[PDB]
Structure formats: C-alpha cells, structure tokens
C-alpha cells in the first residue's frame, strides 16, 4: 500500500566553488566527491559545499497522500530546498534524517529537490578529528515516501516509527513492548485500528490490535504489549533466529499503512570476570572492526559491498564487530542480524589519538548536536538484535576542554532511550581517568608491539587494570598492526610504524601473540581487531602508499586476504577446513634455512620441501604449525603442506626462489 | 593609565589538516593563509581551520586589574582558548570582537592563547557568496587591553564604550548625547566621577561631569548631554575639522581610565531631486569603491597600505568612498575622518550577481548572525563623522529564499542603533522589486557598456526610474570597466568581458562616457566607481591573469594608475596641476593616423608630434583634449603636450604598418 | 657594475647598461647546486655540445655591447661526482676563439685549492659570512688569506647578501636563522654596512656584487615572509619599496642626488625606550629632532652613517625627524613610532 521510491538516479552536481553557470555534471547516487582526492593521499582534500539538484515530477494522484524525502546519510551538514525554498537543515554525517514535502510541492508538475551539502570543518559537529576520511556527499540512498494521510509516522528522528523493546527474556517467556508513532495528517478525526502481528515466516506467533480515535492534524504515541512463551531465541551464529514484526493501521477494514521490522529475542549480560554471557552461556566475542569505505569509491557503497564485507568476516569466523567510528547503514546491521554477529556501534565522538587538536570542544552547539546524534543512533537502529552495546566515544582526552561531564550527560541520554543494552566506550586514557568509569562497559585501544613495546606488555597491562578495578567490564576496543602485501623479508624485525615499510610477516607475528594474550583472559568480554579491512585515511604516509591505514586483515579492495586473516580463520572457523601456508608472498629470499609456518584447524599436517618431507606436526593451541631449520636450495623451491583426515585430504603450496 | 599592548608578534600556526605533531610554523600578525593560493587564481583555495597559538606572560602586577583580548578582524569563525580551555566563539569575519580573560589566566606565569580560526564555507554566516576572496586568518591587529577594575567598558559588541550621538546640528548650535558604559569589576561598591572634555587642539570646548556610586560587579550606562555653541562643522574635504572627545573615569581625585573618540559635527540630507546636501550646501559625491586587499599580502594589510590607498584616493579628487562589501578597518575610517571623505559602509549581505547560489538562506542562525553583524558595524564605528550611510545588502535576489522581510527586519535594527544616519543599499533588481524601497536611500550597480549595451543606456534607465519613482533617492552604487595595463590596441572596440583581452583604451572610453552621464544628473546623490583598485577574486579568468577583478583605476599593487585615474583626477582635482596623455602604454601601433587624447585641468594645451605643432586646444566639459587626424611617422615617434599658465607630458612609440 | 645572473639577458637591457655606463658581467647558465641537491654538470655528450652552443650564442649575440666587460663561465659548480673541470677548460678555450678582447671569469663556491678556480682570467667567490654562518669579519680574513696564497689571482666578490622582509621588524640586532620564517630588516642593513666596509678597504678586489638588487622568484624557498621568494634584494620583488640597505649604498655611491634617510622607519612598534637612531646621508651634517627636541648635530662617518646613541623615547607616540642644511638645499626626513614597554 505504502510506497518507497528510490531517488538515486540522475542528479546534477557542482561545487559552490564553481561559481559560474552551466558547470553542473551528472552524478548518480550514492556519491562522494572525495573518492579521488582523499583516496590519493591528499591531506587537504575538498571539504566544503556541494550542490545536488534533482527534478521530480509530483503526480496528481499523489495529492491527498503524504510525501517524505528520507536521506540515509549525508556528510556532514545538509540544507534541503524544494523549488529553491529552504525546508530544513541537518547537521551530522551518519544518522538518517527526513523532511515532509506534502505541503511544499506543486501537484501535477515537475519540482526541484536541491540538497546543499557541506563536509567542511566545524568545531560544533562531531566528529572533529579522526584517523579516517570525512567523505563529503549524499553517500547513502535517498527515498520518496508516500503514505496515507493517517500513517505510522516516519518523522521521529527518521526512525521507522515502530520501536520494539525486550524485557524478561528467558528460554520460557519474553515480553515485547511496541512503541508506535501514529500521525493523522487529515483535517478530520479518524477511528483507526492499530495492530501488531509477530510472525515466523507466515505463521502468526502473537497478535494484538486496538481501535482508537485520533483527532485531525494530531499525532500521538501508542505502546502495545504482547508475549511469547517458549520463544525461539536469537543465539548469535549458533542460531540467528529472527521474527518479523508487522504493525498495521486499518480503517473500515483494509490496510492503509504498514511497517515491518525484525525482532530477535535474546538476553545477555557482561560479567566482570566471566566475559560475555549470551542467553545463559559464555561466548567469546571474536571481534573485528569495520569502516564503511572501499577502494576507488570511498564510502559511496552499494548493497553488494556491504554483503561482501559481511561474507568475509563470516568466513574468518568473526562473531562480533565494532562498527567504527560512527552510525552505519541499516543494511549492514541487517546482515549482522542475519549472520548472528554481535554489534558494537557508537556515535562519532572521536578524539585525536596520537594526532593534533581535540574531539571535544566546549560549545553549546557541539554538546547539543552530540545528544541529537546519539538520539538518532538509538531510535533508528534499536530494533536490530545484533546491536548489544551503545558506544559513546573513541579516544577522548581530559586535557584542554574536559568531556567527562558531557560524557556522563550522554550516558544518561542513552539510558533515557534504551535501558536494555549496556553502554561502552573505546578509551586510550590511563585507567585512573574518571571517563573510564561512566559507561556500563569499558575497553581500551592497545597496540603493544606496533606503536612501541612488545605484545607481552598487553596482558600485563590488562591483568593489572582488572586487579585494581575488579568491577570494570574490560575489553580490547582495538589491537592491530600494519602490513603491506608487497612488503616481504626473511626475518621478524619490528618495522617503524610511521615509515614506508610494513612487512607482512610482522602483522602475522603481532596477531599470533596478541590473540594468545587475549585467549588466556576470560575476564575480557571481547576483543576487536583494528581492522578487518584497510581503510582510507588521507593523512597517512606509511606502508606501500600514502593515504591508507594498512592494519586491515584484508586489502582495501577486498581482493586479498593477508596471512593473519587465515590465522584467525584457523582459530575461529572450526567448520570450513583450513590449511594455509604463511609467507607465500615472500617469493625472493636471501636465506637458505627458514622457519616455515602454516595455519590449520586439522589435527595434523606434514610439510614437503622440493618433495622432501620435513615431518608431520600438530598445530599448537592457536592453530599454528611450525617447522624450524628448513633448508631450502639455491634458486627455485616448492613448499607444500598436506593433511589427511579420513576422506578429507587438504593441500596448500607455493613456490619461491633463494638468492644467496 | 589604561595599557594597550599589540600582540601581533610571533605566533605558532598549523592547519588542522596537518594532523601530525611538530607541524607548527611561525607567523606574524596580521596574517592570512590565502595570500598565495587564492591570489594565484586557485578557485578552491583553502577554506578550513587554522590554529594560532601565542605564549603570553601574565605579570603579577596585573593581578587586580582587568585583562581584555580584542581582535580587530578574524575571518570568519573564531574560537578562543585560554590555556586550551574554550572561552567563546565569534561568527563573522569583519567586525571586531572581545573577550575578557581577567578570571581565565594564572598571574605571574606563562599562559597560552589558542585561536582556532575557520574560513570554511557556511550557509549561516554572511557573506555566503561574493565576487571576492574570503581570506582566512587573523588578518587584523590583536591587542591586550589592561584597565582598572572599574573601567569604561570595552565589552559591548567590542565598541569603544563611548557613543557620540549628534541629536541636533546647525551652523549655530550642536547638541551631542554621550553614552558611556561603565563596568565595576570590583566586589565592593565604588563612587566614581565620570567626565567628558571636548577639546580643540588643547582648548576645552565644553565639559560636563557627574558623580555616582556603582555597586560591585555591576554595569551601568550613563548619558551626558554636551552642547557646543557656534560649532566648527566637519565640512568634507573643504574643511575636515575634528574635535577630540576625551571621556575619563576619576576616583578620589585621580584619573583611572580614559577613552578618547573623534567628534566631527555635521548635518546633511539626501534630497530625492537635488542629491546630497552637506551642512546646507550641495555636494556631488564623486566616489569609488574599495576592497581591503593588495597584491602578495591578501587582506593582511598594514597601516601604510591603508594610508597609501587613502592618499591615492585624495590625489584623484575622491570625496566619497564606498567600502565594499563589509565593515573595514577602524584605521581606514580614521583616514576618511581626517581627509574629509564621505563613507558608505555596509554589512556583508552580498548576493550572487552574475554567479551561482545565494546571498540569503532562510535559516534562523543566518538571520540571527546578520543582525549581530549589523549591530557590530554601527556600535563599533558610529563615532566616525565620515560614515554617512549604512548599507544593508549588495545584489540580493528575490528568487528562491526571498530576503525581503529579513531586509525590513535589518532596516529596523539599524534605526534602533542609529537614527542620525540614513540606510542605503546596492541593488541589481528591476526597480519593481519591493526590496528596493525598504532603505532610506537606494542605488544600483550598473555596467552599461561593459556587460552588454552602451553607456547611453545608463541615463535612460536612470531617467526612466526617477520619473517612475520620484520619491526614490537614487545613486549609482557601481559602474566600471575592466582594463589591463598590458592590453593595448589602435582602435576602440568592445572586448568580451569574460575573455583574456581587456584593452586599456576601452576602460578609458567607458569611464569618460559614464561620468558624462552621471555629471548631467544631479538627482543622483552619488556615484561610486567599481573599483578604485584592482582586487582579488580567485574565480576570475579574464584580463591579463586569473584571480583578479581588473575594473580598477589603479593596479592591484597600487603601483600604476591607469588612464582613467587621470581622467577623474583632471575632473575632480582642480588643486593639483594635471596634464596627462592617454595611451602611453600603447607603444607599438599599426596605423599611421591617430586620434591623440589628453586630460587636463589647465585651460588649454598644445600637442607636438616629432616637434611639429598640431595646435593649441581647449578641454571639453570633461577635461578631455582631443586632436584628430594626427599623422605619425613610420618607426619611432615622440608625442608631447605642453601648457602654460608650465606643464609638459610626453611618451614615445613606434609605428609598424 | 652589474652581474647579470645567471644567463644571457635581453639586448635592450644590455643597451640600457651601455647608455648608463654600467660595466656588465654576463654569463652562460652553467649553474651549480649551491646548498641544494643534484648537479649543475652531467657528463653527457649532448650536455657538453649544447653548452658550447650556448656560449657561442652568448658572445656572437651581445659582443657589440661595450658595457659587457667580463664573460662568465659558471656559478657554484662542484668537483664531486662528474668533475666539470676539463669541460670548464674547453668553454674557456671557446670563449678565446670567440673573443680575445674581454677576460673570462666565474663565480665559485669551491675551496680556493680547486683547479676550476684558475682556468678563467679572473675569478670571484660567493660569500655570505654573517648570514649563512659566521661573522661579517670572516670575509675579510678569507679574501686576504686567499690573496696572499695566490697573489696572481684577480679576485672579486661575485655574491654577498642577506635576506630581509620589510614586514619583519624588531628592537635589537640578533642573527636570524636563514631558512626560517623570520628575516628582520635591521639585520640585512647591518650585514651590508659591515660587508661593504670589508670590501671598501681591499683595493685588490676588482669588484663586488650584492646578491641581489631585487628580491626574485625561487619557488622552492620557504623563508622570509612568504614562500617562493629569494628575499635578499635591496628592493622588493615589485620594484615598489626600497629597503634600508638600498639607502646605505645610495648615500655611499650616489654623490649627486642628495640623500638623508633614517633607518628603521618600518619598525613602528618598539618595546624599549632607549634607541640608537641611525641615518644615511651624503650631506655634510644633520640634526636629529625627537618629539621636537634636538639630540644635536652629527657628521656622517666614512660610510655615510649618522648615529645618535642613547635616544630616549616617550611611552606611546613618538616623532623622529632628521634635518640637513647645505647652502641652498634643506633636507628633512621623519617617521612616526610607538613605544609599548
Ligand atoms: Cl578530546
Ligand atoms: Cl540572494
Ligand atoms: Cl656541479
């Protein structure tokens, strides 16, 4: 009944700095204008105003309906015009936002949609700093909504208008409360029927409907309640079961409007000594971090790109994700729902880390806008079963303008919006700083063995902190190491992090030792690898090219899994057979005697070097096969590893050459 | 004695796009970071955040005083930090602004000022568009103000704290209402003597004092009424007389704070049919526009630059100047006060003109800020006798977000702030548009004979408008033509304005015809030339080099007066001898036959060509000497002109048929 | 005298030197790296054959100009790497085939021992003692040392100079850092007064050449008051403003146009109350008036320098005027000035 029309095709664009006429060029949404300058490594890429114009014919039959323009993302600040009259402004690059254009168009005519987008710097719109790209543009989809004059309202913070809250969840019973925004845009009072039907496919599981009166040009909220006995729980990747919940408005029979949403029922708690308990059973959060960009296109992502990023994490055995450092797309939360991957999602309250300036500036506009951004985050995505914590900052400092007061304010805003999920944060503060003690959970970013030290520093630090504050729920927000797939060398030696040489073997070593450190500590409720993918950061000058943070387990184009990916796949994915030699891309070696390493989830593998066996071996606790003192021969070599397990015979091999 | 310490020397600077540490460099205020990229013709010059830091030592003997940071101009949005703790933001690149730091520093030790300056694009801080450059930075002076704990307050829209309102002026009597803001920063009540002394050189002209008690931590506004019988009126360039008004705070017989302000007394009115009448006598307003930049340095101007601009204007006989398109430097207002030049100064409410986008966006942060800039402009510069009109917009359009109500709102704000001067605007709308009728006076930007048409079209349009709207007080806000000193040709032909060829002879022809049109029309209360000076406009791609609006009478480096300068000088300056051949820069000619033109304010001159006399000639009504059918030799040629009353002028050129 | 760096210039400018009477050193663009990277000489066949063509072009094109008096062969080459010393000898021989009436010379930055300093008939060195390292007095000792070691060389100073922004001012005379963003004007003034004293006491120098008459373009530079400018001119890059040191030379060198010029007119905000007040004149006397009060008459020293020590300025505004009377001609100069602390 209700209509949702994609508006991405054929816009006109120009930069306000192109001040002459006839300078517009065709673009097609999604779109950023920084996919070339920023990705090329230019730190001063284009940050300012871009102008999108669309011609949209408003049909006559649409008069008497209600028309909305929903934007799923526009970085950073957007001003919307209909036939060149301002209708609204939205400040924030990552929440969806909406405007009703029912009273603003000429029915039966072409009309003009004009979106003036600014991604230039501000001190009053988070994020203010960050180790990533602030791609400017309409980089997510744009939709025309047409509904009945009486509808389930899409206007409240661009939420769906249906909000599904879970309490009393057990293996035996669950209670769901359903908050519905209903809007009467007619001049007449209406007697409507409101109904909720929760379904398993096409089988009704529960159902309640309600008749009530609503005056003209008025909206009110309705909160229905229903129950499910012996509910089918959403249980992570073991069984990511999903009800669909349909809320309908009815009038004289026949549906007049409909909204459907996912319902995944789960209970869980974060235990200071046991970690994360999902539906009564402990669950390691084997996590990675993910940014929303890609090679060549920046953050103008299409559906298939989200799907592919999800598939690669699923393949590696990921069961948790931190979506850094901002609200991300509905269809990615969808995929995490459907795969059973637990989600940490946060507002863009990002501090400087090792860089300059601040993530917090004590401006009324900044503080206020931040609260609206956190309110957008929760109201737009709270229905997703995969979301399990709400994150409030990444790497703020207490020096200069101190955000501790404001963070406490944000924490309270989160609880007003959602009591059912803990808050968390990603800190790089000494443990004594108050801001580590506000959120329900806390976590630190740690690079022991990359930005200085050795991996053993990590377990000591975490052990000490867990001892001094026994009630903290500690996790590793970030840990990782740079790696170019074209940087190879025989020996493990710690590269300079800020230089043009990130040899792949050190990333491998780093994650091996670090996962060992994490896996020995059950008090950590999760760990999150920085990062799943290389991602654009235009100011970086390191690795094999500028403009890239190269700590991904997979390359920026999603083409090449680095060695470390297969290390995590050996450990985390016990379903697909894995047998993978490390260092296949080290193809020109200077030593004759080497240490060979493979990763497997098989019980046993045997190494062969020019057909000459070097023995069977079993992986250690963390899936690592290792043969020291393997003599290669001058010139060409072939290195093959083989494993048999009943009918399952696996093989991996590569070639290489030794010079001197 | 109140202390005023310049803080321009040695600051640390880095762009915020320089994320890495140790990337600061030294700058020395005044400073912009767009003096290289914008003036090189880069359309997307850097519009973003730059961070200035200074270490400043807070002396122990200042504890117990008050301490003010006053910024004369920072484009466009500034946030100021004391020891990295925010103390306020200012939105707007051309008004002065101030923040008190008394309670924000550690006395006796080093402190740090951090000024985070953002010239990035905004849709809520005028100007949004404009044919000029938005040079970012702290491009005007920065002072430390030390005052008594009870002081003449510097905090109200960064005003001087003293307002000199001329409520009645005549050749016999002037009455001046003085408004002084007094601040008590003490925790105890204070009884203080407020005094004002109006001085002529050293002679006290009038004097008024009063005693009151001001309670602790309280601000108050006093209003003393001064009178001057038989006043010495400030009467333009004929006699730019200035009294000095010294307001002082006394306490138990000792002066503790002092503020002096100009007082130039005058009355005037703008007659619909007769033009501008100053102190009872008609003045043609012979005017030019002026921007606050210069080659190589952008808008990071010094005093000598202001002074050289003013002198060049006075040399040409200017007696009115329109300061486009924004509040400019107090120091340049002082100059016009002292020369006697009438000033038109306006808020940066600038529309797109020939270009894209809008001068107005209907959102409340834009409306709010605009009223604040208008209040900033009047409260900060109202004590200059040169400022005679306040302008509200330049080239706004009624399409899209209609700004007409908002301009009515802005008109009422200026009347609230200053009833003694009329409002004006610079329009490019058809006379039908309602926005033309809000301000007391109105004017139009017109380029008949440059952007299409012929100069004769100005008079016809003006005439038609005066007849249709006889109550309008009409002036020409802009008229002008582009020229490069390096584009020369034999004959007069109209260039394509958007092209790379702007021959000088066209600019000279254009101005001589347009002045003729203006000079005939006394109902114009003024005319302003676009522009006195070539200026920066990064998007321009015309003339002899990109990034330059070249409709100036003088070049961007203020080195070379174009031919048109000397036309106006001979018409407007009858005190300095002028005799000047046009076309000396056209040194390679293709025709033997020539029309030789010169400008003069002598009663006659005689032309010589390779020594041969072509005749004594008299100038026309517009100071133009012209000899037709002048016959040049192939090869080298010397053209000379002489007058006696004994002036000479000459240049050499060669002919290649 | 003018040294046209570093390349053949326009005929009309050669003409202008002919007509003023200025002696001209002009040269081929055989320019070395100086303080930068890479080389002026690469031992390619085409490079060498081209260089000869460029020198025959130079001489056959401008030999008629009488102002040209020496022919320059290189600037700041180095012997490290591809040694050009042979190829310098060829060019000098080409010069000799092309023209016998003028000596050849060069502008060196090599230790005096290097052979490439003895090929041409005369030789000069670029010295920056007191700007790039050292004191201005190091220049005298080196020249005399060199003159004593090789009494046959015909030694000139092909380059000496110091950077200055007219917008960099200060109270005291401190050696700035050359590659930094701060070139105060008082230092360039000091540099030239001291270096000219060193030059003018040494008659065995057949000439000296200020680097440079004007600030010139050099995109790579990041010093002084803006990027991309070599700011050692005596006059700005727009030929509009004469820096202090220009007037030190005009007083010294131009004894026909009267000069009376106070130094430091652009330093309009001082921080100290006692000042040394220096002026340059070719008049015989001048009197200094500070806020209308005489600080006495004074005579210029041998190098046209008037100095009044221990000048007391008031806090706030100041007016500094110096005035000369020579029979008919009366000269005055003044500038305003502000003291804060
Ligand atoms: Cl922060
Ligand atoms: Cl507009
Ligand atoms: Cl070399």
Author numbering:
A (entry chain A): 26 to 685
B (entry chain C): 26 to 670, 674 to 685
C (entry chain D): 345 to 685
From the paper:
Here, we define the 53 unique GUSs in the human oral microbiome and examine diverse GUS orthologs from periodontitis-associated pathogens. Although the core glycoside hydrolase family 2 (GH2) fold is conserved among all GUS enzymes of known structure, two loops positioned adjacent to the active site influence substrate binding and catalytic activity. The presence or absence of these loops and their lengths have led to the classification of microbial GUS enzymes into several categories : loop 1 (L1), mini-L1 (mL1), loop 2 (L2), mini-loop 2 (mL2), and no loop (NL).
We determined the x-ray crystal structures of TlGUS L1, TfGUS mL1, and TfGUS L2 to 1.6, 2.2, and 2.3 Å resolution, respectively. First, the AlphaFold2 prediction for TfGUS mL1 was aligned to the experimental structure described here. Fourth, the Tyr380 that uniquely projects into the TfGUS mL1 active site is completely conserved in all mL1 orthologs in the oral microbiome. In addition, we found that while TlGUS L1 and TfGUS L2 exhibited less than 1% processing activity for any compound regardless of pH, TfGUS mL1 showed essentially 100% processing of all substrates independent of pH. By contrast, the mL1 GUS from T. forsythia exhibited robust activities on all substrates at both pH 6.5 and 7.5. These data indicate that mL1 GUS proteins from the oral microbiome can participate in extracellular matrix degradation, thus contributing to periodontal disease etiology. On the basis of these structural and sequence alignments, it is expected that the mL1 enzymes in the human oral microbiome, which are encoded by periodontitis-associated taxa, will exhibit the same activities against CS-like polysaccharides demonstrated for TfGUS mL1. The efficient processing of CS compounds by TfGUS mL1 suggests that it contributes to degradation of the periodontal extracellular matrix. Furthermore, the catalytic efficiencies of TlGUS L1 and TfGUS mL1 were 8000- and 140-fold higher than the human form at pH 7.5.
